[PDB]
């Protein structure tokens, strides 16, 4: 018990040695007014707006940097610590430009409040204010930096979370301006977080410039579907259209940060969006028609076609509830050709034991690892808020990162073992140098990005990695609950698909062409009318008209994750629930119901008729979909290896390369993104 | 006196709520999350019970947002999971409790950034 | 068409409204009236812009006409100032 005892205005709390004075007040429950101190950012002491008075002490101390000592009673509401705030707030406000009705961080200001609660009723600054020169930091951040309180949060985030040290302070005195010395845009993922982290409205979001004002925004808590980290987010909706998506904190998944894609592609959600159910008509043009007519177009073809003549290529952002409603339907006409666009090697236990296909070590385990051998992925642009995880654990802890992929910008110092899938065999043999490095690791982890598995020798690549994980585990003698093998995805509806029993890859549809295909939100080119039977009856089930719509005999519009109470699951199997922020547009309907209804018109009606019932259905297919925010550990790995050992495959010499080589690759990757005007502006800025 | 009864005190029939707004409607007990835009933690301390989001459409004449969900602007505020589950069960609504998410303790030190 | 679009598409049934009636539309677009104004030349690096008034104009903000490259524009009046 190394607790040390310290008094918060008397509550006499006991705290670990090394907790800051500000932290001591927090556990009692008091809040020190603070600027320039963020929990996951280094203490800087720039503002000194947190001056408090420990007891019988000569001067005020900075609650952000003073380690509380033994038996110091903090007096947070003394007559002194209020003159130490009534007089600081005098200064921050003195050089501040009064354009609060321009500053769109109007009600979202941590500087008006603290002025309005702890600061002063009046002003004594009868002199002249200063002005700085607005510069361009990008097409996402509007830096009206005459607002800046030189709190250096931005500089730190830019250097400690995102590894992009482009921002910095220049000059001394009252014209220290915290902007890039040369005008180089702040181009990085994790970029938009600066907005959320600058308490002042100096730099704010340019798309959401002046569309709203925070008191009005109704805030619904939901889940990120753009990437497979499944970052928690809050969708701010006003009068029924989404106005902004900002992060909400999840310790394990996104701890207060969200990607540039899943914050500025809410605009893409509002155009090129399907709404009414069109049906090919006349010469072939698609013609808007009522559900009844469009549904029976599909139902009639479904009754005519038998099993293995009906197939589904789902993929992208479809929810688990639709995925079970599409499987239950196509099995009621006996085709189990349901498939996903992202090919996960099934030449093994395959989709059968989750240990196989789930980051086993959780995102939060990256903090406890000792060496990570990333093979096949550019975590940065595939799963950015997991790249950050390895960013923090390489800085605050000591992770030794090794990449077997293309040498790529990783925001940290990795070891480039090489660009060849066969050198995986080199480490398994113990031939390559890093073989000992791992031998030295007590808690190692290996990450294989699905983006590799998508090549032709992906089955061989998974088997080769499983062999190395096997002897890495044997040589290290790592404990059982520590799990070395994990694989990260880049498609939101993959893990759930795989769990619900959907077989990955369109390989099965390729060998026998289905008379009728019900593409379920699939905008990928995995099959085309060109590769289908002459009949080629195909019906798109989705939200945005992109690739599957113009080659579709029927259009059954659906919703998006802002518009339905569906479930998703990220890579380590944590199921999460999207909440309806806005009602779905036009005649468009929830994905699960379209398929329950088509089944009623077809006559093979599905059992559930309300969503709680579909949640009960999910419980039957895979039981850890009905369970939210819980990661389950049963590492059925040992048996996975046995089947891997049976599988014999050749890893071709072609280097394994992540598709998202540089950030322009990243911006536009999905229907809701490829339709983004903001993403498009970002794409041309890079090009 | 002191009669004994064994119900979950369903006052669903004393409340006066039209059936369809007591049957097909899910309350979501949760402690509101912080506005990333600010760092004040005073709006993440009391458990709220908000209802499902139904249609918010457009008034043809002026373009305003219109609605038919009488229980749309409803955000009852409780002080503990226990007291929110009780009210929902009391009124006959379906609930989706979400556990609180207090930040864990993260150790912060000024000197640390000076090491080399 | 209003300064902010709004023009109804010919097919829009929302056009009956104006039958035997008309459409309230302001002819004085502020996008152009403000452009029909002389860039306020100044000597000082920074200048104020009370909105041409004290308490009868807009909150007073100081604009940095520091780069001839850009004429500072008070976010309230849209007045460009030429260093």
């Amino acid at each position: 018990s190394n607790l040390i005892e310290v008094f918060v205005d008397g509550q006499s709390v006991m705290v670990e040695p090394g907790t800051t004075v500000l932290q001591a007040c927090e556990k009692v429950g008091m809040q020190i007014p603070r600027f320039c101190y963020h929990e996951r950012l280094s203490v800087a002491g720039n503002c000194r707006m947190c001056l408090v008075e420990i007891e019988k002490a000569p001067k005020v101390v900075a609650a952000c940097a003073m380690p509380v000592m033994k038996g110091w009673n903090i007096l947070t509401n003394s007559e002194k610590s209020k003159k130490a705030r009534e007089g600081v707030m005098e200064f921050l406000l003195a050089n501040h430009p009064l354009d609060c009705p321009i500053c769109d961080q109007g009600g979202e200001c941590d500087l008006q409040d603290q002025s309005m609660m702890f600061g002063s009723d009046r002003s004594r600054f009868l002199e002249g204010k200063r002005a700085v020169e607005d510069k361009n930091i990008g097409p996402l951040v509007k830096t009206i930096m005459t607002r800046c309180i030189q709190c250096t949060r931005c500089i730190r985030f830019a250097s400690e979370i995102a590894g992009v040290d482009d921002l910095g302070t220049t000059g001394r005195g009252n014209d220290m301006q915290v902007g890039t010395y040369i005008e180089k845009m702040f181009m990085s993922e994790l970029s938009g977080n600066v907005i959320d982290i600058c308490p002042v409205g100096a730099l704010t979001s340019k798309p959401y410039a002046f569309t709203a004002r925070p008191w009005e925004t109704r805030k619904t808590e939901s889940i990120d579907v753009m990437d497979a980290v499944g970052s928690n987010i809050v969708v701010s909706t006003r009068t029924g259209e989404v106005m902004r998506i900002l992060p909400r904190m999840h310790e394990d998944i996104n701890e207060e940060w969200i990607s540039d894609k899943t914050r500025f592609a809410y605009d893409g959600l509002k155009r090129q969006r399907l709404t009414e159910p069109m049906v090919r008509n006349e010469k072939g043009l698609l013609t808007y028609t009522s559900w009844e007519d469009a549904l029976s177009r599909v139902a009639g073809m479904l009754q005519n076609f038998e099993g293995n003549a009906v197939a589904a290529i789902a993929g992208g952002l479809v929810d688990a509830e639709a995925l079970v409603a599409l499987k239950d339907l196509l099995n009621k006409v006996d085709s189990d050709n349901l498939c996903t666009e992202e090919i996960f090697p099934t030449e093994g236990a395959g989709t059968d034991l989750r240990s196989n296909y789930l980051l086993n070590t959780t995102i939060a385990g990256v903090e406890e690892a000792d060496v990570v051998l990333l093979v096949g992925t550019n975590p940065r642009f595939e799963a950015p808020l997991f790249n950050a995880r390895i960013r923090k654990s390489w800085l605050h802890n000591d992770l030794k990162v090794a990449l077997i992929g293309s040498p790529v910008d990783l925001t940290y110092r990795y070891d480039h073992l090489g660009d060849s899938p066969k050198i995986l065999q080199d480490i398994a043999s113990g031939r390559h140098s890093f073989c000992e490095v791992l031998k030295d690791a007590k808690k190692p982890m290996v990450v294989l990005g699905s983006s590799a598995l998508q090549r032709d020798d992906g089955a061989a690549i998974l088997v080769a990695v499983s062999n190395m994980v096997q002897k890495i585990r044997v040589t290290t003698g790592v404990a059982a609950e520590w799990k070395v093998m994990n694989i990260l995805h880049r498609i939101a509806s993959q893990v759930a698909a795989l769990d619900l029993g959907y077989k990955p890859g369109v390989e099965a549809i390729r060998k026998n062409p289905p008379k009728m295909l019900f593409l379920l939100g699939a905008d990928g080119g995995c099959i085309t009318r060109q590769d289908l039977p002459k009949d080629c009856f195909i019906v798109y089930q989705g939200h945005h008209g992109d690739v599957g719509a113009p080659m579709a005999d029927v259009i059954l519009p659906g919703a998006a994750y802002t518009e339905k109470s569906a479930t998703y699951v990220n890579t380590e199997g944590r199921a999460q629930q999207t909440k309806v922020a806005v009602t779905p547009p036009g005649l468009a309907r929830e994905d699960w119901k379209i398929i329950r209804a088509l089944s009623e018109i077809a006559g093979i009606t599905l059992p559930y008729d309300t969503l709680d019932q579909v949640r009960n259905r999910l419980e039957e297919v895979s039981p850890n979909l009905v369970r939210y925010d819980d990661i389950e550990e049963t590492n059925y790995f040992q048996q996975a290896s046995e089947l891997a050992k049976l599988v014999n495959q050749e890893v071709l010499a072609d280097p394994l390369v992540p598709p998202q080589l540089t950030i322009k690759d990243f911006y536009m990757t999905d229907s809701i993104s490829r339709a983004s005007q903001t993403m498009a502006k970002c794409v041309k800025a890079v090009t | 006196q002191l009669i004994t009864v064994d119900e979950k005190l369903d006052i669903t029939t004393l409340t006066g709520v039209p059936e369809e707004h007591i049957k097909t409607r899910k309350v979501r007990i949760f402690v509101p999350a912080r506005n990333n835009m600010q760092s004040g933690v005073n709006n993440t301390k009391k458990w709220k019970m908000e209802f499902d989001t139904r249609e918010r459409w457009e008034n043809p004449l002026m373009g305003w947002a219109s609605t038919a969900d009488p229980l749309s602007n409803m955000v009852l505020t409780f002080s503990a999971k226990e007291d929110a589950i009780a009210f929902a069960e009391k009124n006959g609504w379906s609930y989706d409790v979400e556990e609180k998410k207090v930040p864990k303790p993260k150790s912060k030190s000024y000197g640390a950034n000076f090491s080399w | 068409i209003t300064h902010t679009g709004q023009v109804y598409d010919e097919k829009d049934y929302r056009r009956v409204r104006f039958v035997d009636r008309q459409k309230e539309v302001n002819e004085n677009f502020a996008i152009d009236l403000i452009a029909q104004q002389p860039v306020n030349e100044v000597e000082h690096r920074i200048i104020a812009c009370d909105g041409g008034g004290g308490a009868l104009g807009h909150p007073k903000v100081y604009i940095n006409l520091d780069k001839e490259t850009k004429t500072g524009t008070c976010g309230y009046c849209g007045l460009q100032f030429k260093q």
Partner: peptide, 27 residues
């Protein structure tokens, strides 16, 4: 120091949504 000019309201909003326009020629 009966009239036709009657105020009529709008939705001065720029329509806030965009539907996919179906492909012009068949496949």
């Amino acid at each position: 120091p009966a009239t036709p000019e009657q105020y009529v309201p709008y939705s001065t909003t720029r329509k806030k949504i965009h539907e996919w326009v179906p492909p012009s020629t068949p496949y």
